[PDB]
Amino acid sequence: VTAITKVEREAVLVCELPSFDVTDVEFDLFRARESTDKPLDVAAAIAYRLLLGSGLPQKFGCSDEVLLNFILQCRKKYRNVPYHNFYHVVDVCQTIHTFLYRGNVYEKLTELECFVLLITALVHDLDHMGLNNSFYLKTESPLGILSSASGNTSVLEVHHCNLAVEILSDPESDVFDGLEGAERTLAFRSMIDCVLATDMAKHGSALEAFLASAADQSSDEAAFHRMTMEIILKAGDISNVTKPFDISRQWAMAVTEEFYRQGDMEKERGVEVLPMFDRSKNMELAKGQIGFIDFVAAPFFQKIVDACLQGMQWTVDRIKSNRAQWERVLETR
Numbered sequence: 001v002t003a004i005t006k007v008e009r010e011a012v013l014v015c016e017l018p019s020f021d022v023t024d025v026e027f028d029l030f031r032a033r034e035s036t037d038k039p040l041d042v043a044a045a046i047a048y049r050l051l052l053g054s055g056l057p058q059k060f061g062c063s064d065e066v067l068l069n070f071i072l073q074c075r076k077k078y079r080n081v082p083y084h085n086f087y088h089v090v091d092v093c094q095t096i097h098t099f100l101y102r103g104n105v106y107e108k109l110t111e112l113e114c115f116v117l118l119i120t121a122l123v124h125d126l127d128h129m130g131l132n133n134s135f136y137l138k139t140e141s142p143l144g145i146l147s148s149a150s151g152n153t154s155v156l157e158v159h160h161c162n163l164a165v166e167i168l169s170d171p172e173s174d175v176f177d178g179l180e181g182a183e184r185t186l187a188f189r190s191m192i193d194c195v196l197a198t199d200m201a202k203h204g205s206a207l208e209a210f211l212a213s214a215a216d217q218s219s220d221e222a223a224f225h226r227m228t229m230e231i232i233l234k235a236g237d238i239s240n241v242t243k244p245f246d247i248s249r250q251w252a253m254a255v256t257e258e259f260y261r262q263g264d265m266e267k268e269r270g271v272e273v274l275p276m277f278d279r280s281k282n283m284e285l286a287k288g289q290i291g292f293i294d295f296v297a298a299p300f301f302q303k304i305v306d307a308c309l310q311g312m313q314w315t316v317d318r319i320k321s322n323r324a325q326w327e328r329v330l331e332t333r
C-alpha cells in the first residue's frame with residue numbers, strides 16, 4: 001500500500017462541485033458523475049467536502065491531508081463493478097450525512113460516533129468483486145472455505161474489515177490517529193461492528209435488537225449508541241428506494257446488472273442461479289422495486305422512524321411516492 005502522492009491529492013482539491021449541495025436529501029450523485037470526465041475525483045471531492053463540512057475531523061486531530069489520504073486509500077480498493085464501486089460508498093456517506101444532520105440523528109450520538117459513521121461508510125464495501133456471500137459459499141471458493149473453516153459466514157463483511165484495518169495501520173491515512181485509549185478502541189470496535197451489521201442475513205435480528213433497545217428507557221446507553229450506529233449504516237446501505245424516483249431507478253439498474261453478471265458466472269459454473277440473477281427471466285424492474293419496498297425497505301424505515309428516528313420521516317414519504325410511481329409504470333404498461 002503506497003503512500004498517496006501530492007498529485008493524486010491535487011486532482012481531488014481542484015474539484016469545486018459548482019451547483020451541488022452535498023448536504024441536501026435531493027443531491028444527485030449521477031448528475032455529479034455526469035458533470036466531468038474525472039468522476040472518481042468528483043466522488044472523492046464529495047466525500048472530502050462532507051467530512052470537512054461536518055467539522056468532525058478537525059475536532060479529533062485528523063488533518064485535511066490525512067483525511068484526503070484515507071479517502072484515496074479507500075478509492076484505490078474499490079473495483080470497476082456496476083453497483084458495489086466507489087460511487088456506492090460515497091452515496092452511503094452522503095446519505096448518512098443527511099440522516100445525521102437533516103434527520104437530526106446526530107442528537108442520539110457523540111461527535112466521535114458521527115465521525116466514525118461517516119468514515120465507516122467509505123470502508124464498508126472495500127474490494128467488493130460484485131459477488132454476494134452466497135456465491136463464495138455455493139462455489140466452495142477459497143474465501144468461502146476460509147469463512148466456513150473459521151466459523152464466520154459474513155464472507156465479504158469480514159474481508160472488508162481486514163482492508164479497513166490495513167488502511168488505518170499507516171498514520172498517513174489513519175483518520176483515528178488523533179485518538180488514544182478508550183476513544184481509539186471505540187472508534188475501531190464501532191467501525192467493525194457497523195460493517196459486520198451490513199450482512200443482510202442479520203437484517204431481521206439487527207432491526208429487532210435496535211427496536212427492543214429503543215423501546216427500553218433502561219437500555220444500556222453504550223449498547224443503544226452502538227445499535228443506533230449499526231442501524232444508520234444499514235439504513236444508508238438500503239437507502240436507494242428513499243431517493244428521488246429517477247436516482248432510485250438508476251441505482252436499481254446498476255444492482256440488476258451486477259446480479260446478472262453473478263448469475264452468468266453461476267451458470268458457467270453449474271451452481272444454483274436464483275431468478276433475480278437470471279438474464280433470461282427478464283424480470284420486471286417495477287415488480288422488483290415494489291417487492292423490495294413492500295418486504296424490506298418500507299417496514300425497516302417505518303419502524304425505526306416510529307421507534308426513535310422521527311426526523312427521518314421523509315425516507316418513509318419518498319418510499320411511498322416511489323411505490324406509487326412504480327404502480328403507475330405497471331398501470332400504463
Ligand SMILES: [Mg+2]
Pocket residue numbers: 124125156198
Ligand atoms: Mg456490503
Ligand SMILES: [Zn+2]
Pocket residue numbers: 088092124125198237
Ligand atoms: Zn454497501
